[PDB]
Symmetry: C3
Subunit: 212 residues, 3 copies
């Protein structure tokens, strides 16, 4: 039975080599500049119509990578002491696209992610206070603010602020932050389930499109 | 030779046991049909809408007086009235509990600084009648918010979730019907995981205990 | 010579340990010394309020190092680190920290609101710039504080605090400092999950403790 462990580790090594080669040779569906430009073109419109136009355009530019209307749902998000709402359009293990915002405004922690985030503002204001600094910057509709991996900032969204977000990195690690206040502050298990279901629907779509 | 009108005593005993079993299992159900709420659903709102024109101090005092006059033995006395902090859903305010049962509660809530956060999903229906200030509500699934001013009442259905914002110096009365302990579970989340203010935990639990003691001593006398 | 009961000598040793512990606690309270006076940090920081908060912080650090050498962290150990607690978020820079005392620069460029925290310690805060809204427990009114003023937070008191944009202050705290650090990391653990900030805060406290120990044993 000593060779059974050798066979198990051999199969495991070949499988891990497959996984490594696949993770290495994977391309990305979206480009940061693509999402940024699509969101900047629609910043002048009201956020409802801008969301609609951007979703239609994303669907026509990358078919099979945008959730259908039957699976689009606004879901609240409580994290880092702030509260907003998001609608997920695309979600994989390495990429995500969503619409985020708040009609009341909010303030809190940006989150320390293993990913690169890009928020292009459709309406409102985005105040960012970078770590180690004593001043804050402000971003207005049409501008794009980037969150590098391992960075943490303080964030402040003014009333009626809405943006398009494109994240790229270790996506399953970000759920730990985005659901922290849902577990320990709001105890909103229904919203937790809705978020997990949106993520799973995005994964399902990506898998079926990759398999055809 | 047995008369067809007689009844065996053991069968009669067992049949009376079955009869009391059925009668008890039937009248236990009617307890959920004879449910009596101490306050009407819109009574608290129509009561507080009258004192909205005054400052919150005098308004609270006169409303407490009138509520004691209307429902004697159902409002906590001046000895047990206490302002305690409430940290929940990422917002912070203060409450003063006037009535508390396992299915109903009434309190004076508000904030002198303003706050924002998550309303919470309760197994209960909440009603907030504004005495002073502003109340901003952002319902789930929408991308817009509504504002409520003194005199108006905001109704929060069971299972609903909204984002909320209280401006500076907002004060309201509040009435709630449903599983009150489940809502107390939410009202103490940030007190445990954010503020660590165990004295506030003790204060809120003591207010609830005083309300329950008053509701039980009124039922017995 | 005679014997003592199994419960007799037990209660006798209980009383002996009680006497020893009580008199030792009293002896420790008698020998308690504080590096900074109760109103020293506030008086010193009020002199720099109104200036640019950067210039004020630099001059205050220089002055504190001049007045108490060996009790202020060196430049290579000063670091701005975020703090998330009671629903509010800001940034701190620790200048002095032991088991009984601490001195820091606190503030936020965005403003925040939350729970002050209930401590076993007396905490004074002298505003360098910005605004400080306070709401005391049991009241329905709030008091505003402007630069130059000092807000005192007594042991066991709990208030609702609000900092306006670009609010910066100097803070001196005296009491059970570990119990205040416990509150200082609540949201960092259960809300932000920023383990790097947790490490930074604990490392700053450890550096303050190390400096205090070295100066106590070797005299700065
Ligand atoms: O919703 C999220 C979490 C992103 C929050 N999202 C990132 C950080 C943010 O706070 C930010 C701060 C500073 C900067 Cl510079 C840029 C972005 C904006 C909001 C999510 C995560 C996983 C998932 F499957 C679905 C949704
Ligand atoms: O703390 C509470 C619950 C009331 C919170 N109180 C109601 C919900 C609230 O979040 C709300 C938001 C929006 C709307 Cl529309 C209505 C109500 C505002 C604060 C409590 C009170 C007494 C008790 F024994 C146990 C718990
Ligand atoms: O404990 C802390 C974090 C200070 C937060 N610090 C708490 C009190 C504060 O929140 C406050 C509230 C109300 C009032 Cl009135 C005044 C001050 C201000 C900020 C610490 C930091 C470094 C260290 F090495 C040891 C301990």
């Amino acid at each position: 039975r000593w060779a059974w462990a050798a066979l198990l580790l051999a199969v495991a090594a070949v499988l891990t080599q497959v996984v490594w080669l696949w993770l290495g040779t994977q391309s990305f569906v979206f480009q940061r500049e693509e999402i940024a430009q699509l969101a900047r073109q629609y910043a002048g419109l009201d956020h409802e119509l801008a969301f609609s136009r951007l979703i239609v355009e994303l669907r026509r530019l990358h078919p099979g990578h945008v959730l259908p209307d039957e699976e689009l749902q606004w879901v609240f998000v409580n994290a880092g002491g702030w509260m907003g709402a998001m609608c997920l359009l695309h979600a994989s293990l390495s990429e995500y696209v969503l619409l985020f915002g708040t009609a009341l405004g909010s303030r809190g922690h940006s989150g320390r992610y293993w990913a690169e985030i890009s928020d292009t503002i459709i309406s409102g204001t985005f105040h960012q206070w970078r770590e180690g600094t004593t001043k804050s910057e402000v971003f207005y509709p049409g501008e794009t603010v980037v969150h590098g991996p391992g960075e943490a900032t303080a964030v402040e969204w003014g009333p009626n602020t809405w943006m398009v977000e494109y994240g790229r990195g270790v996506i399953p690690s970000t759920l730990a932050f985005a659901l922290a206040d849902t577990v320990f502050s709001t105890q909103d298990f229904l919203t937790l389930f809705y978020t997990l279901r949106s993520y799973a629907r995005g994964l399902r779509l990506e898998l079926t499109t990759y398999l055809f």
